[PDB]
Amino acid sequence: GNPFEGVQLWANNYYRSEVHTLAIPQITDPALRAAASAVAEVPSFQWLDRNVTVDTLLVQTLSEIREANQAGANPQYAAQIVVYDLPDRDCAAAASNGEWAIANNGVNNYKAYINRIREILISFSDVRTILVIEPDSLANMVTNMNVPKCSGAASTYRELTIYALKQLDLPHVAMYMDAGHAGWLGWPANIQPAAELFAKIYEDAGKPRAVRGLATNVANYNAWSVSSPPPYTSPNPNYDEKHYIEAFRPLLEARGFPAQFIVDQGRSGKQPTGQKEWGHWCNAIGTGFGMRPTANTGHQYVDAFVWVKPGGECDGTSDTTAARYAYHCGLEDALKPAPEAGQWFNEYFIQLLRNANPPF
C-alpha cells in the first residue's frame, strides 16, 4: 500500500519555470545547461508554510494535476505537499518565519488552516495527495525541551498534530510526520524517547488510516547511505538515514506504529557536505542534488526517496539587517549572499547541479 507506487509524481511548473527562466540562461557550460533542463522535471514537494498558500498554491497545484490526469496521464500524477504552519513554530530556533503564536490565537488560527486544507483536499479526492506534516516540530520534544519556548509549545504541538492527523485522514491522502534526521533523533540515546513519542501520538490519534509513517532529512543534507561517517557526524554511530531508520523502526513497531519512511535526498548527493557542524541547515556549502525521487528504494521500511526541499530555492537571507534574518544563514558554511527564503538562489542551484550525484 505504498502511496508512491502506481503514480507519477507531479513536477510543478513553478520550479520548472524558475529553472528555465532564471537558471538556464546563466549557464555557460553546455553540459550544465542540459542537466538543468533535466532537473526542471524532477518532482519536488510544494510548501504550505504560510496561510496564504492554502487558497492559492494548493488549489492551483491540485487543479493542474487534475487537468493532466483527465487528459490521460499514465500513470496518474500525485501531489506532494508540506503542511508547515504550527503556532510558536520552530520553537528551538533562534529565529523563525512562522506567522502564528500560541499567545495570539494561534491554536484557533492553525485549526482553521487545517480545516480549510481539508475542505480543499475533499474537493480534490481524485488527486492522490502525499503530505509531510510539520517539519521541525515534534522532534524538538525529544531533545530541545530545555529551551523554554519548546517546553511551552510542547502540549500544543502534540494536540495540534493529533488534530491534523485526524482531520486530514482522507481516503486519497497519505501522511508522514516529520521525524528529524540521523543527527537529531538518530543518536542512540534519542531513539527510544523518539519512538515513545511518535508511537503514542499515532495511538492517541486513533491510528488513522492515512498516517503512513514518518519523513526524515526534510530540508537537510544527510546521506541515505554513505560508507564512511562524515566528520561532523562523529561520534554518532547512526551517521546516515539508513542507520537511523533501521534502528528506529523496530522500536516504533514494537510500540504499535509500523511506520514507513520517506527520506529527503534533494540536497544529499555530495558526501561529506561542506557543513562544519551537523546542525548547520541554511544554504549549506558543498552540497549536490541527490538520488531522484522514486518508490524503488530497495528498502522495505522506506516507501520513497523524495525531494522535499526544492534545491535552488533559498533557505533564508544572509542580509543581517533583514527582520527575518536567521544567524545560521550567515555562517561561514552558508552560501552568501543569499536572497529571502523561498526566492530563487541561482548560485546555490548551480552548486547543486555541479555537485549532483548521480550525475544528470
Ligand X SMILES: CO[C@H]1O[C@H](CO)[C@@H](S[C@@H]2O[C@H](CO)[C@@H](S[C@@H]3O[C@H](CO)[C@@H](S[C@@H]4O[C@H](CO)[C@@H](S[C@@H]5O[C@H](CO)[C@@H](O)[C@H](O)[C@H]5O)[C@H](O)[C@H]4O)[C@H](O)[C@H]3O)[C@H](O)[C@H]2O)[C@H](O)[C@H]1O
Ligand Y SMILES: *[C@@H]1O[C@H](CO)[C@@H](O)[C@H](O)[C@H]1NC(C)=O
CB of 50 to ligand Y, least distance (A): 9
Query: Which residue of 87, 106, 183, 269 would you call a contact of ligand X, by CB under 6 A?
Result: 183
Give the residue numbers marked as catalytic: 136, 315
Task: Provide the mask over 34-73, with x wherever binding to ligand X is found by CB under 6 A and - wherever it is not.
Answer: -------------x-x------------------------
Residue 51 interacts with ligand Y (CB under 6 A): yes or no: yes
Q: Give CA–CA dist 289/273, Å, rounded.
A: 11
The entry of ligand X, ligand Y, none near residue 109 (CB within 5 to 8 angstroms by kind) is ligand Y
Which stretch in 50-58, 69-77, 202-210, 266-274 sits in contact with ligand Y by CB under 6 A? 50-58
Residue 266 interacts with ligand X (CB under 6 A): yes or no: no
Query: Cβ distance 148 to 102 under 8 Å?
Result: no
**Footprint (CB under 6 A) of ligand Y, residues 53-72:** 54-55
Which stretch in 4-12, 100-108, 182-190, 257-265 sits in contact with ligand X by CB under 6 A? 182-190
Query: Which residue of 188, 206, 237, 279 would you call a contact of ligand X, by CB under 6 A?
Result: 279
For ligand X, the closer CB: 76 or 129: 129
Residue 287 interacts with ligand X (CB under 6 A): yes or no: no
DSSP E strands, the chain:
8-9, 46-48, 77-83, 129-133, 173-178, 211-216, 260-264, 302-306
Number of residues that bind ligand Y (CB under 6 A): 5
**CA-based end-to-end distance of the chain:** 30
Query: Cβ distance 319 to 26 under 8 Å?
Result: no
Residues 6 or more apart whose Cβ sits within 8 Å of residue 29: none
Residues 6 or more apart whose Cβ sits within 8 Å of residue 18: 312, 313, 344
**Footprint (CB under 6 A) of ligand X, residues 185-204:** 187
Q: How far is CA 22 from CA 37, 50, 76, 311, in A?
A: 12, 24, 29, 14
The binding site for ligand Y (CB under 6 A) comprises 51, 54-55, 109, 116
